[PDB]
Amino acid sequence: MKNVAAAERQLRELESTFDGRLGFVALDTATGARIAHRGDERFPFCSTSKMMLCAAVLARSAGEPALLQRRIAYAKGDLIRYSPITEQHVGAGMSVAELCAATLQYSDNTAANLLIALLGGPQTVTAYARSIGDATFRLDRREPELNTALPGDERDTTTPAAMAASVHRLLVGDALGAAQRAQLNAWMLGNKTGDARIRAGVPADWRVADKTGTGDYGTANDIGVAYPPNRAPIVFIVYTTMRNPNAQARDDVIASATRIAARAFA
Numbered sequence: 216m217k218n219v220a221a222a223e224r225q226l227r228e229l230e231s232t233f234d235g236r237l238g239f240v241a242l243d244t245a246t247g248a249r250i251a252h253r254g255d256e257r258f259p260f261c262s263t264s265k266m267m268l269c270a271a272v273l274a275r276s277a278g279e280p281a282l283l284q285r286r287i288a289y290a291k292g293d294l295i296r297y298s299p300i301t302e303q304h305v306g307a308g309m310s311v312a313e314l315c316a317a318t319l320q321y322s323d324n325t326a327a328n329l330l331i332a333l334l335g336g337p338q339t340v341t342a343y344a345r346s347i348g349d350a351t352f353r354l355d356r357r358e359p360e361l362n363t364a365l366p367g368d369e370r371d372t373t374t375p376a377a378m379a380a381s382v383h384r385l386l387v388g389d390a391l392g393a394a395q396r397a398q399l400n401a402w403m404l405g406n407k408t409g410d411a412r413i414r415a416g417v418p419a420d421w422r423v424a425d426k427t428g429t430g431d432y433g434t435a436n437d438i439g440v441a442y443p444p445n446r447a448p449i450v451f452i453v454y455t456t457m458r459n460p461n462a463q464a465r466d467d468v469i470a471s472a473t474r475i476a477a478r479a480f481a
Contacts, residue, residue: 219250222479226252229471235433235457237468240379241476244387245447250476254376258454259364261428262322263378263438264340264354264371269315269402270385271343272330273395276311280394283312289329295359298325319402319426324358331357344381347390351377362430364456378438379452386424386440387448400424403439411466412437413451416473418481420444433462437469449480
């Protein structure tokens with residue numbers, strides 16, 4: 216595909232503008248047209264792992280959806296940084312569903328840790344990934360330590376290719392039951408943290424479901440699905456990480472990568 220080959224070249228050129236690595240997949244789900252850069256290399260996934268976490272929660276609830284209405288009376292002692300919903304509601308507690316919405320839409324780190332604990336630990340998220348055909352994803356740590364993004368560390372990493380396959384299965388395909396897939400999409404469509412990333416790189420008539428991540432080493436990620444009107448969904452996976460430990464995470468590289476792929480598909 217000559218449009219794909221041109222986009223891949225443009226992604227190489229984009230990576231040459233900074234001292235770091237770009238990991239990218241865009242997949243047109245109707246045709247299987249697939250744009251990839253460093254697709255089989257590992258990248259620190261940061262808060263993009265919250266999508267896998269919440270898929271695991273939804274899967275765990277499928278035989279008894281009322282489990283999502285269970286109230287979790289967490290403690291002030293559970294509260295950690297970057298927790299804008301859980302810190303507000305610690306007096307009353309929150310339902311499991313509300314914790315999933317907070318984690319996905321606000322990147323609430325306490326909410327993520329509470330959900331990880333409800334499932335049995337980070338190993339249960341890795342096990343869930345394996346059950347839906349992802350042999351690459353690995354969740355080793357909880358928040359905030361999963362954001363260390365250390366050069367050469369395989370903890371808390373995946374590959375762009377593996378994550379593309381998992382996002383496809385989860386949001387578009389049949390990894391989840393219909394109600395669970397719809398709920399995951401609804402949560403991700405309503406994300407509050409991604410306006411300058413994938414959402415900034417697509418045409419005005421495309422809807423986007425996404426989850427961002429931001430970590431150490433200037434790590435800036437965004438994963439999800441674009442829904443153009445009148446054609447099939449397009450999966451977008453963008454991982455970036457920098458060599459300088461003192462790097463400042465950016466939004467613009469993700470938006471630029473997204474625009475490259477959008478031109479290829481239009």
